[PDB]
């Protein structure tokens, strides 16, 4: 409960970053975050 | 990219492949012509 509290209280999905399509608008200029 | 050949092994992350563009697009709202014959029109005006 207390992980996933903390990742659902703050402000921060991969296979559809291209679909997405700023994790999409970040290639416009190329570099990544690397898993 | 690294300029040597032997190369150590691991994962890397070198290049980025850039779609080329296909076809073109062309609007250009018709406009008219600019009246420039008055830059040799009449007299010519003096600098003051």
Redo the contacts between chains.
């Keep these: 409960a207390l992980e996933d509290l903390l990742f659902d209280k703050v402000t921060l999905g991969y296979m559809k970053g291209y679909d997405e399509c700023l994790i999409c608008a970040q290639?416009v200029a190329?570099y990544?975050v690397?898993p | 990219s690294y300029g040597q050949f032997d190369m150590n092994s691991g994962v890397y992350s070198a290049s980025y492949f850039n779609a080329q563009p296909r076809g073109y697009y062309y609007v250009a709202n018709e406009l008219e012509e600019c009246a420039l014959d008055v830059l040799f029109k009449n007299i010519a005006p003096q600098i003051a």
């Design positions: 290639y190329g990544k690397l």
